[PDB]
Design an enzyme around this catalytic site. Structure first.
Site, PDB file in Angstrom:
ATOM      1  N   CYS A 169      28.435  10.422   1.095  1.00  0.00           N
ATOM      2  CA  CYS A 169      28.495  10.787   2.524  1.00  0.00           C
ATOM      3  C   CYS A 169      27.121  10.924   3.175  1.00  0.00           C
ATOM      4  O   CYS A 169      27.013  10.921   4.399  1.00  0.00           O
ATOM      5  CB  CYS A 169      29.261  12.107   2.731  1.00  0.00           C
ATOM      6  SG  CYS A 169      30.650  12.361   1.629  1.00  0.00           S
ATOM      7  N   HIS A 196      27.966  18.224   9.504  1.00  0.00           N
ATOM      8  CA  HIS A 196      28.614  17.253   8.637  1.00  0.00           C
ATOM      9  C   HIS A 196      30.114  17.430   8.872  1.00  0.00           C
ATOM     10  O   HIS A 196      30.835  16.448   9.036  1.00  0.00           O
ATOM     11  CB  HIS A 196      28.222  17.484   7.176  1.00  0.00           C
ATOM     12  CG  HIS A 196      28.820  16.506   6.218  1.00  0.00           C
ATOM     13  ND1 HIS A 196      28.796  15.138   6.418  1.00  0.00           N
ATOM     14  CD2 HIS A 196      29.446  16.699   5.030  1.00  0.00           C
ATOM     15  CE1 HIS A 196      29.382  14.541   5.401  1.00  0.00           C
ATOM     16  NE2 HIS A 196      29.791  15.461   4.547  1.00  0.00           N
ATOM     17  N   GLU A 209      28.984  24.998   5.096  1.00  0.00           N
ATOM     18  CA  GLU A 209      28.001  24.522   6.070  1.00  0.00           C
ATOM     19  C   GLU A 209      27.721  25.610   7.097  1.00  0.00           C
ATOM     20  O   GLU A 209      26.576  25.812   7.511  1.00  0.00           O
ATOM     21  CB  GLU A 209      28.451  23.232   6.758  1.00  0.00           C
ATOM     22  CG  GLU A 209      27.386  22.664   7.692  1.00  0.00           C
ATOM     23  CD  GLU A 209      27.705  21.268   8.183  1.00  0.00           C
ATOM     24  OE1 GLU A 209      28.866  20.832   8.013  1.00  0.00           O
ATOM     25  OE2 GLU A 209      26.788  20.603   8.724  1.00  0.00           O
ATOM     26  N   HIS A 252      35.857  10.681   9.053  1.00  0.00           N
ATOM     27  CA  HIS A 252      34.701  10.623   8.178  1.00  0.00           C
ATOM     28  C   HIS A 252      34.454   9.171   7.794  1.00  0.00           C
ATOM     29  O   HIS A 252      35.236   8.574   7.042  1.00  0.00           O
ATOM     30  CB  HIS A 252      34.962  11.480   6.941  1.00  0.00           C
ATOM     31  CG  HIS A 252      33.796  11.613   6.017  1.00  0.00           C
ATOM     32  ND1 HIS A 252      32.558  11.034   6.273  1.00  0.00           N
ATOM     33  CD2 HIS A 252      33.664  12.264   4.842  1.00  0.00           C
ATOM     34  CE1 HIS A 252      31.738  11.327   5.288  1.00  0.00           C
ATOM     35  NE2 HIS A 252      32.371  12.063   4.401  1.00  0.00           N
TER      36      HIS A 252
HETATM   37  K   LIG Z   1      26.111  15.085  11.114  1.00  0.00           K
END
Ligand SMILES: [K+]
Ligand SMILES: [K+]
Ligand SMILES: [K+]
Ligand SMILES: [K+]
Lengths: 413, 412
Positions: free
Chosen positions: B164, B303, B314, B340
Site C-alpha cells: 500500500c 491512509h 493511524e 483502496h
Molecule cells: K494518504
C-alpha cells in the site's frame, strides 16, 4: 550537508556455488560451475535442460519448519542470507539503534511458485480455499518485510523490482539512503527463486534461455557459440553502514561503496539498446558519482549473461566508456559459474566485487572455448587472477532497459 | 551533498472517480462515491461484493488495440496516466534532455491478470502456448519500462514495490533523485489493476477486505462499524521537476515536495504495529526532512483504509506526533470515495494532496455515520472545506509494515 561515507561491514549469500559466502566465493575463484540438470521441475517439456540450483539447501537448518512453511523460497533465501550478513557484521540491532537500521532488498519475480500452487488450488477448490497467507507469501516486498521482522530493523524500508538490475539498484538505493543521513545501517541486496514452471515457460517462450543440454558449455559468456542465459536461484545480501558508526563499534570493513548510476534504454521491452548506449551511460554516471577517472577502474564484474545481444553490447559499452583503457582493465562474468540469478544477480555480484578487492583476486569467466571477434576484451578466461584492486565496477543491464552500475573501492582511512 | 528544490509541474490520473485529474478531483471535492457492485469478476463465490472500478475506460481511446494487447491493465493505466501527466506539464522530451528525465512508477501487484490467464493456458495447453510476452507483461517494473519507451525517458529509472506504500515510496524516491541532482525531471507515482480472481480471493482469505455488500456504506474510514477495505484500481502519476529547470521552461507549478519519511514496523506480515508507532516515526521523519514544526501541517490526507486497526492506529499515531495540534489540523481519507487503490493509492492521494494546496479545498471523508470514541479527530466529515493550506501531509501505512509519508508545500 556533507555526504556520509558508506562501507560494507557484512556479507550473506546462498548461491548455486555454495550455501554461504565463503563457499560461494571459494568456488568462484576456482572456476567451479554451479550449473547442472534441472531437478526443481520436470524439464521434459521445456526447451531448457539445465539450471543453476542451490545444492543441499535445507531451510530447516536455519529456522523452524513452521516459519519456513509460511515463506516462499525467495523469502526463505533472503531471510537466511540477511541473518548471515548481520551475523558476519557482528551487528547487535538493539532497541536503541533499530530505527536507524533499515532493509532494502529486492526480488525480480517474487513468489511465483506460491502463485502457481495457490492458483491451482483456486481452480480446483474455489476462491474460499485460497490460503490466508497467499498474498503476503507471493508479493516481492515480503523479503524485506520478513527480514525486517527477523532482524528487528525499523529504519528506511523498501523493495526495488527492476528485473535483472534488481540487486544492483537495491544496493545503490540503500547506499544513497545512508549517504544522505537517513539511516546508519542498511541490509540490502537481491533474492530470487525463479526456478518454477511459469518462469521456465516464460523465458523459453521468448527464447531468452539457452537450450544447450550440456551443463559444461551452457553458460559461456562472450563465447562465439553462446545462445542464451542459464537460470539460477539464491540471494546475495550485504550490510551497508555509515563509516563513523562502523568505526565506533569496531566493525570489520570489507571496502567502501562510492558510485551508483541508473539509466534507461527507452528502447524495447526486452531487447537491449544498440551498441549498449544505455549501459555506457550508466557506467559513466557511476564513474562521475565516484568522482574518479575511468582509468582508475581495475576490474569490471560484467552483467555477462551469455545471451548474444548482452555480451556483445556490453563489450561495446565498455569500449565506449573506457576507450584505450578498455583493453587494459580486466572484465569477467561470474554468471559463467553461477548462471543468471535474475533479481539476485546484482547481490551476489556485489559480494564477488567486494571480496575481489578485499582478497586481491579476480574471479574468471569459465567456458570460453571459441573466441568471438566482437567480444575481444580480456575476460580473465579459465583461471582466477591474483592482483591488488583499488576500484571494481559491477554492471546489471536488465531486461526492460534497466541499467544499473555500482562502483566499490578498497577501504582507506 | 546537493540539495535542489523539487516542484510538481504535471498531474495525470485514472481513478474510480474519473478518467482524468479534473474529473477525479471535482468528484472528490463533491463527495462522490466511486464504489459499486463488482463487475470485473463474478463475485458470487467471493466474500467481498463491492469494488471501486474505472468507469467507461476503454483503452482503445488512448492507443491501438494491438498495443493494448501487449500490456496488462496495470501497465495500460500507467502509460495512459503518465502521458496525461507529461502533457499537463507541457513537457517536450527531446534527445537533449532525455538522459535527465527519469521514471519511477511502482505497482504493488503488477500484472496478476496476465499471470492468471497465462498460467491457465500453461495448465491446459502446455508451456509452448505461453506467450513470449508473458514475462514482460506480468512483472511490475514494466509500467516504468513501457512509460520510459513511450516518453523517450532515459534517466534514472526504477520501480518500488511496497504494497500500500508503493505510490508514496515511489514519489518520495523520485523526489530524492532530483534533490541530490541525479535527474531534472521524474515521472513518478503508482499504478494498480488488482481486480482479479486471485487478488479478490487472497485479500478475502486474510480477511482484509470488507464483506459489506452495501456500496453506500462499505468504505467508511473512522466509522465505528468499519470492517475492512474496499478494493479499487487506477493510476496516479505526477511530474516532479528541479526548480530552476521548471522556471527555465516556463512550466506551471502546482506546489513543492519538501519531506519524505520511511520506516518499518518490524512487527507482523499483515497486522499493523500497536499504537501506530511505526507510522508515527514515519511522519516524524518526513517532518524532520521538511525542516518544519509539526504545528505547520494544516491537513493530513490519511491512509485511512477503513480497516478496524488501520484507522484506530493511524489516529493514535497522529496524536503521538502532533500532540494538541492533532485536534487543530484537518484529517481526511479519500478512500471513502475512491476505495483502496493499493499500489496506486499513494499516487492518487499525492495528487489530491497537491490539488488541496493549489485549489485551497480539503476533500471530505464521506460515509461516517457512527462516531468511534477511539477515532475522535476532525475527519472533515461529508463536505469539502475551503481553506488556505500551506503544508499537507500524506500517509501510506502498508501491509507488511511499510510506512511512508510525504509532505507537500504551497509554492510562492
Ligand atoms: K494518504
Ligand atoms: K535461446
Ligand atoms: K555484475
Ligand atoms: K474484514
Amino acid at each position: 550537508m556533507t555526504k556520509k561515507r558508506v562501507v560494507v561491514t557484512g556479507l550473506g549469500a546462498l548461491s548455486p556455488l555454495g550455501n554461504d559466502v565463503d563457499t560461494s566465493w571459494n568456488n568462484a575463484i576456482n572456476g567451479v560451475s554451479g550449473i547442472g540438470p534441472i531437478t526443481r521441475v520436470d524439464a521434459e517439456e521445456y526447451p531448457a535442460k539445465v539450471a543453476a540450483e542451490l545444492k543441499d539447501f535445507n531451510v530447516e537448518d536455519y529456522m523452524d519448519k513452521k516459519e519456513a512453511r509460511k515463506m516462499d523460497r525467495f523469502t526463505q533465501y533472503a531471510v537466511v542470507a540477511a541473518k548471515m550478513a548481520v551475523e558476519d557484521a557482528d551487528l547487535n540491532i538493539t532497541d536503541e539503534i533499530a530505527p536507524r537500521v533499515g532493509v532494502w532488498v529486492g526480488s525480480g519475480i517474487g513468489g511465483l511458485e506460491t502463485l502457481e500452487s495457490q492458483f491451482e488450488i483456486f481452480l480446483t477448490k474455489g476462491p474460499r480455499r485460497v490460503s490466508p497467507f497467499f498474498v503476503p507469501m507471493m508479493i516481492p516486498d515480503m523479503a524485506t518485510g520478513q527480514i525486517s521482522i527477523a532482524l528487528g530493523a525499523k529504519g528506511v524500508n523498501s523493495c526495488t523490482v527492476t528485473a535483472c538490475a534488481t540487486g544492483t539498484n537495491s544496493i545503490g538505493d540503500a547506499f544513497k539512503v545512508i549517504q544522505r543521513g537517513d539511516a546508519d545501517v542498511m541490509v540490502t541486496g537481491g533474492t530470487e527463486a525463479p526456478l518454477t514452471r511459469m518462469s521456465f515457460a516464460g523465458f523459453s517462450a521468448n527464447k531468452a534461455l539457452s537450450t544447450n543440454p550440456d551443463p559444461k558449455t551452457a553458460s559461456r559468456p562472450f563465447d562465439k557459440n553462446r545462445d542464451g542465459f542459464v537460470m539460477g536461484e539464491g540471494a546475495g545480501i550485504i550490510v551497508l553502514e555509515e563509516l563513523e558508526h562502523a568505526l565506533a563499534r569496531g566493525a570489520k570493513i570489507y571496502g567502501e561503496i562510492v558510485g551508483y548510476g541508473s539509466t534507461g534504454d527507452a528502447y524495447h521491452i526486452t531487447a537491449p539498446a544498440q551498441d549498449g548506449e544505455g549501459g555506457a551511460r550508466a557506467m559513466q554516471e557511476a564513474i562521475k558519482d565516484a568522482g574518479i577517472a575511468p582509468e582508475e577502474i581495475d576490474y569490471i564484474n560484467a552483467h555477462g549473461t551469455s545471451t548474444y545481444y548482452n555480451d556483445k553490447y556490453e563489450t561495446m559499452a565498455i569500449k565506449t566508456v573506457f576507450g584505450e583503457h578498455a583493453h587494459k582493465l580486466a572484465v569477467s562474468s561470474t554468471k559463467s559459474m553461477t548462471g543468471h540469478l535474475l533479481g539476485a544477480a546484482g547481490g551476489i555480484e556485489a559480494i564477488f566485487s567486494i571480496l575481489a578487492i578485499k582478497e586481491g583476486v579476480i574471479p574468471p569467466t569459465i567456458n570460453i572455448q571459441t573466441p568471438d571477434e566482437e567480444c575481444d576484451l580480456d575476460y580473465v578466461p579459465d583461471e582466477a587472477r591474483r592482483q591488488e584492486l583499488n576500484y571494481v565496477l559491477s554492471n546489471s543491464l536488465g531486461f526492460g532497459g534497466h541499467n544499473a552500475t555500482l562502483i566499490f573501492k578498497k577501504y582507506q582511512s
